[PDB]
Amino acid sequence: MLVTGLEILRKARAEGYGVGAFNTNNMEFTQAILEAAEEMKSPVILALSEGAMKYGGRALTRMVVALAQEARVPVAVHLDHGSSYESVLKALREGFTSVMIDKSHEDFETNVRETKRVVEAAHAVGVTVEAELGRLAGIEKDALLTNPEEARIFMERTGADYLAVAIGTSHGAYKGKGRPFIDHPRLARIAKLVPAPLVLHGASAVPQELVERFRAAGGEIGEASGIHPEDIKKAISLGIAKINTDTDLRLAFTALVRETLGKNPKEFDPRKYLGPAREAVKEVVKSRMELFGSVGRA
Amino acid sequence: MLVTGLEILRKARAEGYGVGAFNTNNMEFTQAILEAAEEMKSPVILALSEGAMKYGGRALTRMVVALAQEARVPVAVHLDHGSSYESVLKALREGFTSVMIDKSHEDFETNVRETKRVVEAAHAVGVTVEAELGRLAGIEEHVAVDEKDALLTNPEEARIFMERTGADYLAVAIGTSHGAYKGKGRPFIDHPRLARIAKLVPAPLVLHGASAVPQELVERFRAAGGEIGEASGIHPEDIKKAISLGIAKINTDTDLRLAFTALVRETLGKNPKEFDPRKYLGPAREAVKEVVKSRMELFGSVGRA
Amino acid sequence: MLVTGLEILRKARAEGYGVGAFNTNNMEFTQAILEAAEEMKSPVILALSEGAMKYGGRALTRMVVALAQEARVPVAVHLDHGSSYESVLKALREGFTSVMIDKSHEDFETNVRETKRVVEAAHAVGVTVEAELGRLLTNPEEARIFMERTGADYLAVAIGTSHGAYKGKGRPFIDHPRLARIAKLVPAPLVLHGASAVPQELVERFRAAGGEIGEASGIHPEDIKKAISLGIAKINTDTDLRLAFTALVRETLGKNPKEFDPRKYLGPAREAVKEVVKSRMELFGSVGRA
Amino acid sequence: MLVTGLEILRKARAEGYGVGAFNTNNMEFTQAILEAAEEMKSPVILALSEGAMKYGGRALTRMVVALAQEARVPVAVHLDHGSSYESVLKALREGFTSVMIDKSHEDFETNVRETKRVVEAAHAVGVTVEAELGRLAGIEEKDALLTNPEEARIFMERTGADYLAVAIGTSHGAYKGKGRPFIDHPRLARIAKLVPAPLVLHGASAVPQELVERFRAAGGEIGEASGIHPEDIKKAISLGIAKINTDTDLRLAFTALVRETLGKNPKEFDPRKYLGPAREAVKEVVKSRMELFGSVGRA
């Protein structure tokens, strides 16, 4: 059933577990993510960037909302990192149950202003909002990360429902040389000041096994590095209630596409290579839920 | 908008042009097909095999019906070679506007029996029915009494089959067959046979296994991933005459799969560092859209919406 | 959320309570019933007769199915008393999650043939079926055989009720012994049709607002309580709903001649139906069962 | 099929006819309106007021939108007289294809600010907006409650609104003015020259005598009911009115039938038996309306 973010994110933080948000751009990804959630009896978030809405169009948005409603477990549909008030309005129009505008690159007053305007429109129609303070970039001394104090003020001036924090993560397959630094003490401090559920983006693990599977097939990838699993577990115990995963899914999906087409030159039936790719995505989603502890939490 | 197609097809034959039916299995194929339809302002049929339904499930069926409705051109959603009564029932349940039961391999009475049962079920819920007589197998120009009663639709039988069953369309067997290997050189199409059947069967006619399997495409596929044999499809001119002769609905599947895969292979082959799905499914979807468009140009449905 | 009748009815009998199946013909009725189920945190069944489907059309079926999915309680959408195989097809086409063809009036064999053919089509698409044997009596042994022959999912038995505002004179008959006997031979959930309470208070209210009603007679509460305990898991409800609705439309229009705003007389009428549904859920014991 | 108001209205004004917008509050009304539009091969607008939003809830909004998409004729779903930005947002949320806010009671600049903000939100979403300037009041003081033409042109230019609702004499209800309601056509004709965008006429029910008396007969009471004369509608359209709203005529027709069936049959309590013919009467009214507006066959 369709629900807002706040719904399940609160029980998540109060219960000491995290709910995974997974990015999707088409049918096979949406199925993999929802079946995984059904089998694991876990709540889940379908994340759709603006890039997704562009590639997906009406086909994607109506289907995600439709499958989300028809699922037996709680499912929210979030627009991730919206870039404008107008983008947010389109997400509200397409039935998203949670939205967010990324103005973390703006000065404080501008971020508060943009965010607050989004909060009023979203709440006006029963939708929840994820605010964003600090910039997603790996590393403190320069204070490019979330200021816990500013975080409480941000949440108070805007009336956002949950907060995305910058403590060391970043999108993509190269989050750092070796194990990326995650500022836990900073996270704990923010958590003491912001009781609202916390959000962790750019959280892919980029597992070595997966990195090698990609190479073994199509190949070509550098010193890829993701967020260490132990850091995910710790960040969640401090208050992270929502964790996004996009890169691991893309990698798993393409690795299977390449090995299937590589091993079967004569093959030209789409489902024969996209189906296995879909399965691999579903498996990734499940270990992800197991990792976050959202299993059996629906 | 969502239509049953009978009206789409009736106007197709009445005006001597064909409407393309295109197989889909996911989002990318559905978008390409429908966009190609919006462009060209052409009516179109979204075809889903039983394999598509299993692969796509509710996600696919729900999406195809929606979108079909939203479209600004006439769109029909057909089952295509339904294997059983229960298969047709699943199609009715998922909102298809036209179903098809394939019992061409069975004797005449069993075909009629099964088909008729489908017509009653479909018509009870405002859905149209396509039925086929004769096996879709290729034939050379050597066989005598073979390319007659043995294989290929027999006109007299056609009229009778269509009358005993309440079918609305009728797929005919005149030399076409599925897959990329339709026959050495230009596969023979029994045009006179099609002509006779049309003279006895007024209902719109349907042509399956009609992919063109263009050489350039074959070579593009080999140039990338590769490995395909002496691909041979139905000649464009045969498609034109057949259409001028009463063929109102033409199914295309192989051409789309090949184009889509050709592009996936080359994009992934050219950019090993790529793992963002849309980077290879996007250009693959675009190649499918272009295939559909040219297909509509060949069918004469451009601007017929 | 939208589910088949079996899913909801199976647990009902296994838990010792009954689920109400309330007939709807339009928006206000569908809302009254769903809002009742939500507040009572109870599973519910929306029943649509062939007349309902005729009157409401695709406007009604689309809506009922949509509201049911979005419901925060388990909801089933039933064709109730289908008169033909084609009628059932339509119900499956419109997204119904449960169907039933009424062939009780036919001979056993005809009933079994007709019903078996419905079970085959519905099951083929994941929809469950209710089968009827008797007149709104039923032999406990005929049921067992009837059920095993036609793989139906739940059975409605003739125990002494009758769909109408006059189910007898003194008190309507409810052969509890006959129920237990069949409940012993049929483990599948049992259904009770024509079990309206046609309350004295409502009859009086209906009359006070103009409008005539004969010696109204319905089923007694205790009989429902006992029938349920014995195995009745689904109780069809309609008459009482129409009465309350009409009772209110009348007095509102009578006490306000200048009133021509539809929501002014249909709204309080919708309210009365919601209240009947709630008390109906209490009686069946489905409150807080979602 | 679902379309915004602007599509059909622009065509209407150029071709010289009007498209009817009919208020609905439940299923029966929505069915009556759409069936009439289908049978008349006419485009139609389904109008929902905030009262409708409250009364029908999500059940009504989702149904109206779905049936609109399904129809074989152009159908727009408009919010009529939204009372706030938040209200307009909800309407965008529920899939409406045209919205409007009514702050015409406020001063010009406040009205412009409020409308422009609504325009930006709707257009960003592919939805069109109807602006309102002036108070809907009957007349026989000058510009105290009427639509100042030159002000309209300025109103439309500053607020990128798609169409304009004018106050040239109409008002809501079944009591529009003693005798024949006065319609300030000249006022309309001037505004029309200053504003090329399609015009809208609210409070335009005819309140026909044979329906009023029909109501009294086997029914309740009603004062000296009076609506806009058919001629005033026929001409207002020739001068640029592309959209005409009807609400009261439908409520009356519907209640009249409800009252007659119940009154003539005290034993009746099957809702479909009294709502059904009520729905048929509203449908006949809608059909006559389309005929009057000149939209038949314009689908």
Side-chain angles (χ1 to χ4, degrees):
Chain A
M1 68 167 284
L2 245 191
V3 300
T4 67
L6 235 202
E7 153 111 2
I8 43 192
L9 296 183
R10 278 175 169 173
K11 290 185 182 180
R13 176 165 164 169
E15 278 269 0
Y17 68 80
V19 174
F22 301 84
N23 291 87
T24 298
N25 292 280
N26 73 5
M27 185 188 288
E28 287 90 337
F29 274 68
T30 305
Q31 300 175 300
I33 299 167
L34 290 183
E35 299 183 342
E38 289 293 337
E39 307 182 342
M40 229 68 161
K41 290 178 64 62
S42 170
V44 70
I45 292 168
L46 288 179
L48 282 77
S49 50
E50 295 176 304
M53 293 175 312
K54 262 293 290 55
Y55 179 81
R58 290 183 167 180
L60 180 58
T61 61
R62 291 178 176 67
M63 168 181 275
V64 164
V65 180
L67 297 179
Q69 295 192 292
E70 301 190 306
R72 283 182 178 270
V73 304
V75 173
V77 176
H78 293 200
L79 173 48
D80 207 44
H81 301 109
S83 63
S84 67
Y85 182 65
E86 293 69 49
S87 170
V88 168
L89 288 184
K90 294 183 177 178
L92 292 187
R93 178 64 165 185
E94 300 180 0
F96 282 40
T97 63
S98 289
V99 299
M100 78 168 89
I101 190 174
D102 182 8
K103 290 291 181 172
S104 60
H105 61 279
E106 296 290 312
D107 60 40
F108 192 60
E109 289 305 308
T110 295
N111 189 4
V112 167
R113 188 193 317 128
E114 292 280 328
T115 303
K116 192 180 174 184
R117 183 177 199 203
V118 169
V119 165
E120 308 173 326
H123 287 188
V125 307
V127 174
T128 52
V129 179
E130 179 176 313
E132 199 168 359
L133 193 64
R135 286 187 189 165
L136 296 190
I139 356 71
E140 48 164 52
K141 300 289 72 179
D142 72 313
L144 211 175
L145 301 173
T146 300
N147 180 305
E149 234 68 50
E150 182 176 62
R152 172 164 57 181
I153 299 171
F154 187 53
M155 291 300 279
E156 279 175 346
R157 274 225 250 160
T158 71
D161 304 289
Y162 24 101
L163 171 73
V165 293
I167 54 174
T169 69
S170 50
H171 296 134
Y174 306 94
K175 303 184 191 314
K177 293 202 63 176
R179 179 172 178 169
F181 167 75
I182 296 300
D183 198 334
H184 292 294
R186 178 190 242 60
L187 202 200
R189 187 173 313 155
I190 303 169
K192 300 190 180 180
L193 305 186
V194 178
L198 300 180
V199 186
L200 199 62
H201 286 280
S204 274
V206 188
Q208 199 53 38
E209 12 282 292
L210 182 52
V211 178
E212 299 171 61
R213 200 175 199 292
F214 187 61
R215 291 208 191 89
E220 288 290 324
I221 181 57
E223 294 297 69
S225 184
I227 302 293
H228 192 109
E230 280 306 85
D231 287 314
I232 295 297
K233 295 177 176 182
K234 184 171 183 168
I236 290 177
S237 61
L238 293 190
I240 295 302
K242 176 182 174 193
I243 306 80
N244 285 218
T245 302
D246 181 10
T247 293
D248 295 343
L249 297 203
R250 301 189 191 190
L251 263 198
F253 196 85
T254 310
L256 267 292
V257 174
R258 311 187 81 121
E259 53 184 59
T260 294
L261 289 169
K263 297 176 172 183
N264 302 282
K266 309 178 200 306
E267 182 68 63
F268 63 80
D269 180 329
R271 49 212 169 189
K272 285 293 171 172
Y273 49 93
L274 302 180
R278 171 178 57 196
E279 267 308 302
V281 168
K282 179 183 181 176
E283 285 307 308
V284 164
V285 171
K286 284 155 140 299
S287 56
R288 215 56 180 148
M289 300 170 315
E290 192 276 71
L291 176 65
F292 305 155
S294 74
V295 172
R297 293 308 200 299
Chain B
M1 49 168 49
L2 189 57
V3 294
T4 64
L6 173 52
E7 300 302 69
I8 299 186
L9 288 332
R10 277 181 173 170
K11 283 189 170 58
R13 177 172 178 171
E15 188 55 294
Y17 72 75
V19 166
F22 306 82
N23 289 276
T24 316
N25 279 276
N26 66 5
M27 190 187 301
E28 284 88 342
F29 279 73
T30 309
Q31 301 179 302
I33 301 172
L34 288 184
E35 286 176 40
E38 296 297 27
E39 291 182 40
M40 260 70 281
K41 308 180 189 293
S42 173
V44 70
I45 292 176
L46 293 185
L48 283 75
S49 67
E50 254 169 42
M53 282 181 86
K54 182 188 202 298
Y55 181 80
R58 23 181 278 182
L60 180 59
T61 52
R62 300 300 57 187
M63 178 189 262
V64 172
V65 184
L67 285 196
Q69 315 175 312
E70 281 174 59
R72 291 179 161 293
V73 303
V75 173
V77 178
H78 294 209
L79 165 55
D80 192 48
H81 298 135
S83 63
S84 63
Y85 183 68
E86 315 91 65
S87 178
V88 166
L89 289 184
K90 289 176 177 177
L92 299 181
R93 173 74 166 181
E94 275 344 0
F96 288 39
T97 61
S98 338
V99 299
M100 182 191 318
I101 177 66
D102 177 32
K103 295 292 180 176
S104 72
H105 52 287
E106 298 264 28
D107 44 43
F108 196 72
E109 289 302 309
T110 302
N111 192 339
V112 168
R113 177 199 313 152
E114 290 282 317
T115 297
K116 192 187 175 199
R117 185 189 194 192
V118 166
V119 170
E120 307 179 316
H123 290 186
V125 306
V127 171
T128 54
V129 173
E130 185 185 309
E132 58 193 306
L133 186 57
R135 188 118 49 176
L136 280 178
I139 35 68
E140 310 204 68
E141 308 169 61
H142 318 314
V143 292
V145 186
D146 300 5
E147 55 179 55
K148 302 179 187 174
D149 294 304
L151 178 73
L152 309 185
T153 308
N154 171 69
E156 270 57 37
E157 281 185 48
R159 177 196 302 185
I160 299 174
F161 181 64
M162 287 301 267
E163 286 173 351
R164 314 208 18 207
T165 69
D168 308 288
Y169 314 135
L170 174 63
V172 304
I174 60 179
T176 66
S177 73
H178 303 304
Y181 307 104
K182 307 187 184 306
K184 292 191 178 180
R186 177 173 173 175
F188 179 69
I189 308 307
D190 204 313
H191 289 301
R193 191 180 208 83
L194 179 53
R196 293 185 181 180
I197 307 166
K199 300 190 180 180
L200 307 193
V201 185
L205 300 180
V206 191
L207 189 63
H208 288 86
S211 273
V213 202
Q215 186 52 47
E216 23 288 304
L217 171 46
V218 175
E219 300 186 56
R220 188 181 200 293
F221 178 60
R222 309 195 102 298
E227 284 201 44
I228 188 175
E230 296 195 66
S232 180
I234 306 302
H235 192 78
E237 297 304 308
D238 282 313
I239 291 292
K240 286 177 179 178
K241 189 174 185 175
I243 293 173
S244 77
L245 288 180
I247 291 294
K249 165 180 174 170
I250 313 174
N251 266 259
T252 305
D253 183 6
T254 293
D255 288 336
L256 312 188
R257 296 186 194 192
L258 248 193
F260 194 86
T261 300
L263 266 72
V264 166
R265 301 197 89 107
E266 71 164 48
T267 301
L268 288 173
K270 295 177 167 185
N271 309 270
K273 300 179 186 307
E274 187 67 72
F275 59 78
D276 178 337
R278 49 210 174 173
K279 295 296 177 194
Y280 51 85
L281 298 178
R285 164 187 60 196
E286 176 63 18
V288 168
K289 179 179 169 175
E290 293 308 301
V291 166
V292 176
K293 283 168 59 187
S294 60
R295 209 59 178 156
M296 298 172 276
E297 288 190 303
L298 175 60
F299 298 165
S301 68
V302 180
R304 282 299 195 298
Chain C
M1 60 181 277
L2 185 61
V3 308
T4 75
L6 231 190
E7 172 162 344
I8 165 175
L9 290 172
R10 164 177 291 173
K11 298 177 183 175
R13 181 182 178 187
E15 300 180 0
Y17 68 85
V19 175
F22 312 89
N23 293 81
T24 302
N25 285 296
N26 62 16
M27 188 186 313
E28 291 93 334
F29 271 66
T30 306
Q31 291 172 305
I33 300 168
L34 292 180
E35 282 171 40
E38 299 283 26
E39 280 160 41
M40 253 40 209
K41 290 180 67 179
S42 162
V44 72
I45 292 181
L46 291 178
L48 281 71
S49 60
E50 286 203 50
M53 290 190 307
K54 183 179 192 63
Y55 175 86
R58 197 171 65 276
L60 176 62
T61 56
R62 178 179 313 172
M63 176 174 270
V64 172
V65 173
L67 299 185
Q69 303 170 305
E70 304 186 53
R72 270 175 157 284
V73 287
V75 179
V77 178
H78 296 201
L79 171 51
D80 158 38
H81 295 290
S83 63
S84 73
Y85 181 73
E86 291 66 49
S87 178
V88 177
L89 291 184
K90 300 177 187 177
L92 300 168
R93 170 74 165 181
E94 286 321 85
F96 285 33
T97 57
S98 302
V99 299
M100 76 148 107
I101 189 167
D102 184 29
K103 286 295 179 180
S104 56
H105 65 299
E106 298 294 304
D107 64 53
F108 194 74
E109 287 298 304
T110 303
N111 200 344
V112 171
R113 192 190 329 107
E114 287 294 312
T115 296
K116 187 173 175 185
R117 187 190 185 188
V118 166
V119 178
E120 274 172 31
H123 280 185
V125 298
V127 177
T128 52
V129 333
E130 182 180 317
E132 203 176 62
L133 179 64
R135 300 171 178 173
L136 292 173
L137 288 177
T138 302
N139 174 53
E141 296 172 59
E142 292 185 56
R144 169 175 165 290
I145 292 172
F146 186 67
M147 287 293 265
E148 76 176 66
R149 300 190 66 180
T150 68
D153 299 292
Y154 22 100
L155 165 73
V157 180
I159 296 304
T161 64
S162 56
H163 47 299
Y166 323 82
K167 314 177 189 303
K169 291 188 176 182
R171 181 181 176 183
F173 184 51
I174 301 301
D175 195 339
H176 292 291
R178 211 177 190 70
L179 178 53
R181 286 194 298 164
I182 306 191
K184 300 190 180 180
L185 297 178
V186 181
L190 300 180
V191 191
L192 186 63
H193 284 296
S196 264
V198 193
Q200 178 63 38
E201 20 282 301
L202 192 61
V203 169
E204 287 182 40
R205 200 178 208 266
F206 182 52
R207 289 169 179 161
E212 302 147 17
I213 182 65
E215 307 200 64
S217 185
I219 311 304
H220 189 74
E222 307 179 311
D223 294 319
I224 300 298
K225 287 292 187 181
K226 185 174 180 179
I228 291 179
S229 70
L230 283 176
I232 297 297
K234 170 180 167 176
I235 307 76
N236 288 39
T237 312
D238 185 1
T239 292
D240 298 326
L241 302 186
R242 306 181 186 185
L243 262 183
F245 190 83
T246 301
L248 259 111
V249 169
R250 304 197 81 106
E251 59 185 56
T252 303
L253 282 168
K255 302 180 175 184
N256 301 291
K258 316 186 184 304
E259 188 59 76
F260 61 87
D261 176 340
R263 52 213 160 175
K264 290 310 154 195
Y265 54 81
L266 299 178
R270 175 177 65 196
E271 232 307 307
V273 173
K274 181 182 185 172
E275 287 305 304
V276 162
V277 180
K278 284 160 63 173
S279 75
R280 194 71 176 184
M281 299 176 138
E282 294 178 1
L283 174 61
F284 303 148
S286 69
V287 178
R289 285 299 205 296
Chain D
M1 52 173 248
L2 193 57
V3 310
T4 64
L6 188 162
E7 286 191 54
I8 65 179
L9 299 178
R10 183 166 286 163
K11 184 185 297 182
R13 168 149 180 173
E15 300 179 0
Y17 63 80
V19 181
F22 307 85
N23 291 84
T24 294
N25 282 284
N26 64 10
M27 179 187 280
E28 285 89 334
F29 275 72
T30 301
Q31 292 175 311
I33 305 173
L34 293 181
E35 283 181 55
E38 292 284 16
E39 284 169 29
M40 232 67 292
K41 302 270 292 182
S42 163
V44 69
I45 295 168
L46 278 168
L48 282 82
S49 64
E50 300 188 298
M53 307 252 269
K54 171 67 181 184
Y55 180 71
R58 180 177 304 180
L60 176 62
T61 61
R62 299 193 94 279
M63 166 178 275
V64 168
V65 177
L67 294 181
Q69 297 171 306
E70 303 271 286
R72 298 304 182 191
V73 79
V75 176
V77 185
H78 297 198
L79 174 50
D80 191 45
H81 304 101
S83 63
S84 68
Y85 185 67
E86 295 73 46
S87 191
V88 165
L89 288 188
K90 288 185 170 177
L92 296 181
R93 174 68 168 183
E94 302 320 0
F96 283 36
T97 66
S98 163
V99 65
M100 74 169 98
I101 190 173
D102 176 45
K103 287 291 196 174
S104 61
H105 51 280
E106 291 294 11
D107 57 73
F108 190 72
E109 290 290 303
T110 283
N111 189 349
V112 163
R113 177 181 300 95
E114 281 283 304
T115 296
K116 188 174 175 180
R117 194 190 185 187
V118 158
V119 170
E120 304 178 347
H123 290 185
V125 169
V127 167
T128 50
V129 42
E130 176 183 322
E132 306 208 318
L133 187 67
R135 282 183 168 298
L136 282 175
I139 59 175
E140 311 185 66
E141 50 82 58
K142 185 188 167 191
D143 313 68
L145 295 73
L146 294 187
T147 293
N148 184 64
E150 311 93 311
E151 189 171 3
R153 174 190 47 192
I154 290 179
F155 189 65
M156 291 299 268
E157 68 166 55
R158 300 190 43 175
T159 67
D162 303 293
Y163 22 99
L164 172 68
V166 296
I168 57 181
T170 66
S171 51
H172 292 160
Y175 301 105
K176 296 173 170 55
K178 294 63 181 295
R180 169 162 169 172
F182 171 59
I183 296 298
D184 199 330
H185 288 298
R187 199 178 200 60
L188 194 188
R190 212 212 313 179
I191 303 175
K193 300 190 180 180
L194 295 181
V195 186
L199 300 180
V200 190
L201 191 58
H202 288 273
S205 274
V207 188
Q209 192 63 36
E210 41 286 311
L211 178 56
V212 175
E213 304 181 310
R214 190 183 200 302
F215 185 53
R216 301 211 188 80
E221 62 221 11
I222 182 171
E224 308 173 69
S226 193
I228 308 305
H229 191 90
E231 297 193 311
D232 294 320
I233 296 297
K234 272 289 185 178
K235 184 181 178 180
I237 288 168
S238 60
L239 291 163
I241 293 295
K243 176 174 176 284
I244 312 77
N245 278 252
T246 300
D247 187 359
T248 297
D249 288 341
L250 307 193
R251 300 185 195 188
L252 266 181
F254 191 87
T255 299
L257 268 291
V258 172
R259 297 195 62 98
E260 86 168 50
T261 294
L262 284 171
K264 296 172 178 171
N265 312 290
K267 287 97 180 312
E268 188 63 70
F269 62 87
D270 178 341
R272 52 207 162 187
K273 303 300 172 175
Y274 54 88
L275 299 180
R279 172 180 64 201
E280 272 305 308
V282 180
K283 174 178 177 173
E284 297 183 313
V285 171
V286 181
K287 291 191 300 181
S288 70
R289 231 67 181 84
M290 305 177 149
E291 137 74 356
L292 173 73
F293 302 157
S295 73
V296 299
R298 300 288 190 158

